[model samples]
Target: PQITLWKRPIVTIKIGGQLKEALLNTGADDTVLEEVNLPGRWKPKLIGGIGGFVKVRQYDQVPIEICGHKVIGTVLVGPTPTNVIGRNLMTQIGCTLNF
Candidate 1:
């Protein structure tokens, strides 16, 4: 589906029976989430964002639900301004861009 970039493309994502709002960020190569407790093995890593590189916990094989589609994959947790559904997650839902 085509989405507008004029405003943040936000959606409700379910993780561990909890729902949180997240932004669909095409500019990001991977998905990012705010700090939350989930059962997954995570590693400490640094990611580059708006300001600079920030330390984050990279969780692997995390399950998430978006727009009725359920997928399991990697998710980065950190002190992000917003939860971001990057290309990793968006591609599963058939999202495309137009100029």
Candidate 2:
């Protein structure tokens, strides 16, 4: 007989009236909170990028629950499809990524 392992389901977070189910990607340096398919006050301040620093007006902090764990943080406004739970949270939880 062969042994099997089961992975937990992806967690869905709600932000600005939109629900985003994201993959827990530890490879990411920073957490990316996307504001897609949402309405009202979804702006954020971009410190700087390879391009330059961009300023946004409004944004919102969404609640994220995973495996009975929960967290809240301000997510930026963008056109991405989903949000990324990055190293910021991972380091807090002492988690490591597996291939």
Candidate 3:
């Protein structure tokens, strides 16, 4: 199945047994969540985005579900304005952009 790209590909994603809406962001290299209370081994890191730099927690082996496909990988939790599903997870779900 071919999943096309949208300016903001919003979808519901499941993480840590909780479901939330996330943006399918091809521009981002990793997933960034707005909360740090998730279950995982995490380390502190500074992340810079369109706004500015913010402290974040990078966690490993976090289980996430997108479009019914389950994937386990890294996730960054911090002050990101919104939840994002980045290229790492997007590629896992076979998301491609044709221009």
- Note the clash tally of each candidate: 0, 1, 0
Model 3 residue 26 lDDT score:
79
TM-score of candidate 1 against the unseen true structure:
0.89
Query: Candidate 1 overall Cα lDDT vs. reference?
Result: 0.85
Error (Å) of candidate 1 at residue 70 is: 0.9
Could you give candidate 3's per-residue lDDT for residues 1-99 as a string of tens digits? 555564567888888878888988878998898853687467999877787898988888888888789998889988878898989888887788887
Candidate 2's clash total is 1
TM-score per candidate, chains pooled: 0.89, 0.49, 0.87
Better of 2 and 3 by lDDT: 3
Worst 10 residues of 1 by lDDT: 1-10
- lDDT winner among the candidates? 1
Looking at model 1, the pairs that clash are none
Question: For each candidate, what is the lDDT?
Answer: 0.85, 0.52, 0.83
The 10-residue segment of model 2 with minimum total lDDT is 1-10
User: Over all chains combined, what TM-score does candidate 2 have?
Assistant: 0.49
lDDT of 1 by residue, 25-84 (tens): 889998888866777577999999878888899888888998778988788889898999
